[PDB]
Design a protein around this ligand. Structure first.
Ligand code: LMT
Ligand code: LMT
Ligand code: LMT
Ligand code: LMT
Lengths: 347, 99, 198, 50, 149, 49
């Protein structure tokens, strides 16, 4: 219902052609979670619309912010599918000391707040949510077995009626399909519906589940996430390069995590951040090699070990002129600029 | 529905349809799909490394257009996202810049 | 190419699996290309005897092996000594049989009472009207401790009392293997071979 | 042309994802530089005299 | 693992799979995501430059070795191991303007008549389908009526 | 039955893999076998029931 409202909003925003909606889809993991939904807004070609993608996004956000029923968002897309952002970061918090799902939630909340109040860093986003209401069915095993109900029958009753059972396959339309058995939906809505399921004892009598279990409310994560073999939670977040570089951001988050996380939790970088943290800067070799190779070519051309310097010493001035123009216009030193600088130095 | 579950007291046969509703339904209810708030299904087509993205997008469109001649009326197809436009633009830019 | 040899062997093994005894199949067969080049041998050991090889081997499995396996250039890590932890139920066959039980009864009861459970959900489809909530259910089927395994119910005796596994067996978190021991200067140890990749 | 190759071709050996981006530019620019030099020693003066 | 709690999927399905996979050459990291739809997705990522066909076969060897560890209902449905094709080329939707067909019908139309035709085209690495589910014969039991008999 | 006879020798004297359990974040086997003092003599074999 909320996704369909967001779709209507995007569809009635000038410049939007499509609301490609997937209630159920958690966009951070591309798996299904019932309280999450994703809707992509497809934009008209620039020349068929008045507003830029940022303007359209800002307009949609002002409208979805009025939906009270859940927390809606609309963001600009990454330049590359499968790497995400470029200045931002990606990490997991891992629980290595068996501290459990509630302590992991507290760690997530504490890291996320501390990050939100770092200048140049907004509240990170997470798939993790340990406070999903659930139910716990505590089986009195002695009382089931004392009256002739085997646990295979008891568990099996819960499984088929409440969870569904894969029975076997059948064929239709020339293809193979599953056959599934489950209680119809109206018979698995309430705690009393669980208690009223009947299994059979060794006497042949129908025995209600409720007479052999205690049902109580609880909480648990959905989905459960593991990273490198440990229960974990993801944090995806931004870092403004005009405030802090990605390297300073990572260093800060490492230090935050050392102060905030309890003994037995830690962070691990993933995706692009793992690569930065594990790649060396071969520019420290590549740049001197490039200068020495060019010097040697020129020393040959000029038959002089000193004249090459009349060429090499001027190239910083071209780099300076170019960056000055970038600086004056509010730009950053992105890879297109960086190659521009080297081509200009070549000229 | 005509599966036999047991013999009842009076000798009648208890059938599955006596205790169940049976329908050809869905294997999963976990994900839904709409296009402009109409029911839909989405199809992501990914190229292999070494492919030609522009040729592949054209071939997918051409195949969809051939398949669509056999669609039941009231079912249509769309291509709501085509990221091959970015390299198509870069090629157009190379040619225009050269000129 | 060792990777081509590995895959060809592993796919033939996969085809042999239908011919193997059921008990071999339930444990699982492994196919592994061997890394011939040793780089370093590392041992854990207990100077004052507080820890034995079983403890140290599983410490290595739990705390060391995976952190080594991530180092640049590793091809294989081999652990030598003791075995993986296993929950060991040491039956007294006289007591089992005195309760009228067979070994197969005991195994069946243990498979019944230490098992994965699927507990379902409330509020899932299909419903005539829209559910407001999806509530997952939890039910514990698996056991964790020696005490819990000892409290397994093998049968009800004629007076209605429950016969427990601990009444016919000694239960301990022990070793999956007693075949290989490991010492370092006559102290208990576990050996770790680190092999580089080419 | 060699000086430009001395500058550009090492830039094909930088690390990480950005290094993969730099490689696309560096190799392409180095090629065009070498071919343009070939053309500058052959076709261009030949055309000028003609 | 239909009906199983995310915690049970993580403990009894994702954990043994990860134990088996751990150690595969050139792996950078691995994550598992277990949901209340009963589905586990475990994503194993490998160093840049790894041959993805080699990654695929090594992971499928480790999966095979773990399969005996898995719950019987997981094994009965079957597990899949699939290298990922990360470069998107085109999104295509089927849809019904007037509502005569729903997502169930259209998804299965795509499965029966569209997907295999697209997958044959040269240059295709992967086809992913999003929405509703494959058809299944659903027996919706009334537990009171079952137990009454 | 031979199944029962062979099964008795196998579990008591050879051990039987039962299934798995979780501890320390990992999976481990559950094994059943006679305790060592009940599988030391040929009389111990004959006395299995
Ligand atoms: C108008 C129609 C538009 C349809 C557009 C279709 C493309 C939509 C892309 C949206 C996502 C882009 O953002 C992308 O998110 C995915 C999912 O988190 C990230 O992917 C990451 O998580 C996924 C999901 O577990 C893992 O497979 C993987 O380990 C990792 O790469 C990408 O690194 C990021 O780049
Ligand atoms: C319940 C079971 C337990 C699950 C087991 C958990 C899996 C453990 C994760 C494996 C970690 C691999 O460890 C990681 O390996 C990668 C990939 O080679 C290396 O990664 C790095 O290697 C070199 C360093 O210059 C670069 O060339 C490379 O591009 C870069 O990615 C890192 O040095 C190491 O941090
Ligand atoms: C003829 C073509 C030549 C192109 C060469 C032009 C640039 C040459 C190398 C760039 C110089 C520094 O080289 C490289 O810089 C980039 C960006 O500044 C750094 O990049 C770092 O920051 C960026 C964003 O801030 C992150 O997305 C990236 O993952 C991280 O590594 C690299 O760590 C360093 O290796
Ligand atoms: C319109 C979106 C276009 C595609 C964008 C994908 C980019 C995201 C990168 C992350 C990787 C996606 O990873 C992909 O996950 C989806 C889950 O959503 C899996 O696909 C699954 O999704 C749904 C879930 O009910 C089913 O309809 C489908 O049949 C099933 O296979 C794919 O088998 C896997 O390959």
């Amino acid at each position: 219902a909320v996704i369909r409202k967001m779709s209507e909003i995007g569809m009635n925003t000038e410049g939007v052609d499509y609301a490609v909606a997937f209630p159920g889809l958690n966009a951070l993991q591309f798996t299904n979670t019932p309280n999450t939904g994703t809707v992509f807004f497809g934009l008209k070609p620039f020349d068929q619309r008045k507003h830029t993608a940022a303007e359209i996004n800002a307009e949609i956000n002002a409208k979805i912010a009025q939906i009270q029923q859940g927390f809606g968002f609309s963001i600009l897309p990454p330049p590359i599918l499968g790497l995400g952002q470029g200045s931002g970061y990606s990490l997991y918090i891992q629980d290595r000391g068996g501290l459990g799902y509630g302590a992991l939630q507290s760690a997530v909340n504490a890291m996320s707040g501390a990050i939100m109040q770092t200048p140049g860093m907004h509240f990170p986003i997470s798939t993790y949510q340990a406070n999903v209401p659930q139910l716990d069915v505590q089986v009195d095993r002695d009382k089931a077995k004392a009256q002739g109900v085997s646990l295979t029958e008891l568990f099996g009753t819960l499984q088929t009626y409440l969870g569904s059972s894969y029975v076997n396959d059948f064929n239709q339309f020339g293809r193979t399909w599953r056959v599934m058995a489950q209680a119809d939906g109206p018979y698995r809505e309430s705690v009393e519906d669980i208690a009223n399921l009947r299994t059979r004892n060794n006497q042949g009598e129908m025995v209600p589940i409720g007479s052999m279990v205690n049902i109580s409310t609880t909480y648990g994560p959905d989905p459960v996430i593991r990273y490198n073999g440990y229960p974990a939670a993801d944090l995806i977040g931004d870092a403004d390069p005009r405030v802090l570089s990605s390297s300073q951001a990572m260093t800060h988050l490492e230090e935050l995590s050392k102060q905030i996380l309890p003994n037995g939790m830690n962070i691990e970088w993933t995706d692009l951040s793992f690569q930065q943290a594990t790649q060396g800067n071969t520019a420290l070799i590549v740049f001197p090699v490039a200068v020495l190779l060019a010097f040697l070519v020129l020393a040959a051309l000029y038959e002089s070990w000193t004249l090459p310097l009349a060429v090499i010493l001027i190239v910083p001035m071209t780099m300076l002129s170019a960056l000055f123009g970038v600086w004056l216009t509010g730009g950053d030193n992105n890879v297109f600029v960086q190659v521009g600088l080297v081509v200009l130095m070549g000229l | 529905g005509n599966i036999i579950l047991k013999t009842a007291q009076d000798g009648s046969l208890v059938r599955l349809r006596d205790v169940a509703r049976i329908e050809m339904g869905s294997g999963s209810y976990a994900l839904r799909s709409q296009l402009n708030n109409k029911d839909a299904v989405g199809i992501g087509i990914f190229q292999s490394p070494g492919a030609n993205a522009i040729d592949l997008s054209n071939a997918v469109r051409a195949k969809m257009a051939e398949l669509a001649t056999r669609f039941p009326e009231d079912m249509q197809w769309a291509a709501p996202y085509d990221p091959t436009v970015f390299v198509r633009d870069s090629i157009r830019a190379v040619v225009q810049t050269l000129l | 190419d060792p990777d081509q040899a590995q895959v060809q062997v592993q796919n033939r093994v996969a085809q042999a699996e239908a011919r193997l005894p059921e008990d071999v199949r339930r444990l699982g067969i492994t196919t592994q290309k061997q890394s011939p080049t040793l780089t370093l041998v590392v041992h854990l050991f207990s100077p004052n005897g507080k820890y034995d090889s079983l403890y140290m081997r599983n410490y290595a499995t739990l705390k060391v092996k995976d952190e080594l396996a991530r180092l640049p250039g590793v091809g294989q890590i081999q652990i030598f000594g003791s075995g993986e932890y296993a929950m060991r139920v040491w039956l007294d066959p006289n007591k089992v049989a005195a309760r009228g039980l067979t070994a197969s009864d005991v195994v069946t009861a243990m498979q019944e009472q230490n098992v994965q459970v699927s507990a379902g959900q409330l509020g899932a489809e299909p419903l005539p009207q829209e559910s407001d909530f999806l509530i997952s259910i939890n039910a514990q089927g698996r056991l964790h401790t020696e005490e819990e395994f000892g409290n397994i119910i093998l049968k009800t005796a004629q007076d209605g009392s429950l016969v427990r596994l601990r009444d016919v067996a000694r239960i301990e978190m022990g070793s999956g293997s007693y075949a290989l021991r490991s010492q370092l200067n006559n102290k208990d140890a576990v050996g770790i071979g680190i092999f580089q990749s080419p | 042309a060699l000086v430009l190759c001395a500058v550009f071709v090492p830039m094909a050996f930088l690390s990480g994802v950005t290094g993969q981006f730099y490689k696309q530019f560096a190799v392409t620019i180095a090629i065009s530089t070498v071919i343009s030099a070939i053309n500058s020693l052959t076709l261009s003066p030949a055309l000028a005299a003609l | 693992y239909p009906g199983a709690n995310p915690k049970v999927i993580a403990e009894t399905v994702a954990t043994p799979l990860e134990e088996a996979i751990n150690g595969v050459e050139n792996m950078m990291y691995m994550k598992s995501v277990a949901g209340s739809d009963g589905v586990l997705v475990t994503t194993v990522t490998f160093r840049p430059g790894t041959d993805p066909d080699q990654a695929q076969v090594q992971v499928q060897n480790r999966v095979a070795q773990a399969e005996a560890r898995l719950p019987e209902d997981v094994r009965r449905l079957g597990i899949t191991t699939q290298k990922q094709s990360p470069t998107l080329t085109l999104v295509v939707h089927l849809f019904s303007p007037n509502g005569k067909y729903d997502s169930l019908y259209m998804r299965n139309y795509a499965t029966l008549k569209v997907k295999d035709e697209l997958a044959r085209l040269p240059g295709v690495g992967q086809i992913q389908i999003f929405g509703s589910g494959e058809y299944a014969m659903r027996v919706w039991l009334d537990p009171n009526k079952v137990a009454a008999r």
